[PDB]
Design a protein around this ligand. Structure first.
Ligand SMILES: Nc1ncnc2c1ncn2[C@@H]1O[C@H](COP(=O)(O)OP(=O)(O)O)[C@@H](O)[C@H]1O
Ligand SMILES: Nc1ncnc2c1ncn2[C@@H]1O[C@H](COP(=O)(O)OP(=O)(O)O)[C@@H](O)[C@H]1O
Ligand SMILES: O=C(O)CCCC[C@@H]1SC[C@@H]2NC(=O)N[C@@H]21
Ligand SMILES: O=C(O)CCCC[C@@H]1SC[C@@H]2NC(=O)N[C@@H]21
Lengths: 235, 235
């Protein structure tokens, strides 16, 4: 009844009035590539390290099953597909989303969306949480708050699915292309603090050919950050 | 993202851009009660006696998984739930649909929808095919042909699911109610013929407490027709 016209992402969509976590359901269940798992609300939504992701009714909480046939070294770029897709959808609705490396989307430095990619081999789950009309925690924002009016949730869904399908199809043929789109939509040229084993500060200059964040410390030392258990903080 | 407010039917919805048959998928897949299987198009859609059901893009082709903890003699009424649900939805859209025993819905005697119920052990699969904006076989009709305009397919889905959930929840408590709703929306008082071995003709008087069609032959003999591989047409 949805009449989606995408090639891979959206071939099938499993909708839930409520679920524990779309990412958990997607990782656990036997699902075909391109299947989208979406729920009105999540009772156990999470980000990295099992951190709580508030998922009340009004937001877009979904996961996509992917089985990218590309080199291993390219797999880490899947998170970027999600971030860019969200940014493109926000721009369609005239909202200025910017990427906070490597998985967040901010609007005026307030978090409007988060991307979580999980994989156990050939099966990769791309999770996306986007605040639309729902109430949000402090430090966050939503499409409704930025526009001053409610936004049809299904319209956001259709837009995002269309963008992700296009981005994914091109990623399979040219896995390097996504990097340019990230650069063009990422917050750069500002001081950041990298949190992990210890921490250091510097100017976020750009991302390299592997998607690593390039940071220039005051001494002039250049560090390349690989995303894993490391958190980025703006000053 | 659909934000369905139903209690049971629609708690989960599995959408397909393309599928062989929603009924076949519902029968062979483990699915929680209330799960709706829906597809833009069916390649192997079928009615009674495996007869092909044209299911092109534009129509509403779906199946609902049920498991009625109701007595053993009420189960044949499930088909009526589907038929009445369709009639109610059509009325909301300014269309007067009437039920042709035992599973068809006609508009000015042209078929606009068909219902197919298949009980498979534990669960019962309620299949409904409704012509909305799609092309239909000669002699048939659609909501678009009746209204002369493009009808939003998702709005029809929402309406039907809402009606079915209400009808089903009541059916679980008051299983006899559906019979009177059928009687008041069924084509009666007309002549019909029953094909096959031992064929005969007569006036379709009403349906009894078991949903059997009551026919009065010209001799005065009364026959009761059960919903089997029964082929019934008007005269
Ligand atoms: N709906 C929401 N919108 C925005 N931020 C949220 C929401 N729910 C939770 N958060 C915050 O966002 C964090 C998201 O995951 P996290 O793994 O910390 O990564 P990030 O580095 O992107 O902040 C949570 O720890 C929480 O503080
Ligand atoms: N999209 C459609 N709309 C209306 N009628 C259809 C459609 N596709 C098939 N049919 C008709 O419906 C039949 C299948 O359902 P069935 O309940 O056995 O009713 P019928 O009494 O018409 O044979 C097919 O054999 C065909 O004649
Ligand atoms: O900000 C992050 O660190 C990522 C948050 C990802 C949230 C989404 S909501 C859909 C999917 N299901 C989950 O339990 N998490 C992701
Ligand atoms: O008139 C009939 O015989 C009933 C037709 C039922 C058609 C629907 S379309 C959704 C579901 N999937 C199928 O293959 N058949 C039913």
């Amino acid at each position: 009844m949805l009449g989606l016209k995408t090639s891979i992402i959206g071939r099938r969509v499993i909708y839930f009035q409520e679920i524990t976590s779309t990412n958990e359901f997607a990782k656990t269940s036997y699902l075909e590539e391109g299947t989208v798992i979406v729920a009105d609300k999540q009772t156990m939504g999470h980000g990295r390290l099992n951190r709580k992701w508030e998922s009340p009714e009004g937001g877009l909480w979904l996961s996509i099953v992917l089985s990218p046939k590309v080199p291993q070294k390219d797999l880490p770029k899947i998170v970027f597909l999600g971030a860019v897709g969200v940014v493109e959808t926000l721009k369609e609705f005239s909202i200025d989303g910017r990427i906070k490396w490597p998985n967040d989307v901010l609007v005026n430095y307030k978090k409007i969306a988060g991307v979580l990619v999980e994989g156990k081999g050939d099966k990769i789950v791309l999770g996306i949480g986007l605040n639309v009309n729902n109430k949000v925690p402090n430090g966050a924002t939503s499409m409704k708050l930025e526009l001053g009016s409610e936004v049809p949730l299904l319209s956001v869904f259709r837009s995002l699915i269309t963008n992700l399908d296009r981005l994914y199809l091109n990623f399979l043929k040219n896995p390097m292309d996504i990097l340019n789109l990230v650069r063009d939509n990422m917050i750069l040229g500002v001081r950041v603090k990298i949190l992990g084993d210890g921490s250091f500060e510097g100017i976020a200059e750009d991302i390299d050919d592997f998607g690593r964040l390039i940071i220039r410390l005051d001494s002039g030392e250049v560090k390349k950050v690989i995303y894993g258990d490391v958190s980025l903080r703006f000053l």
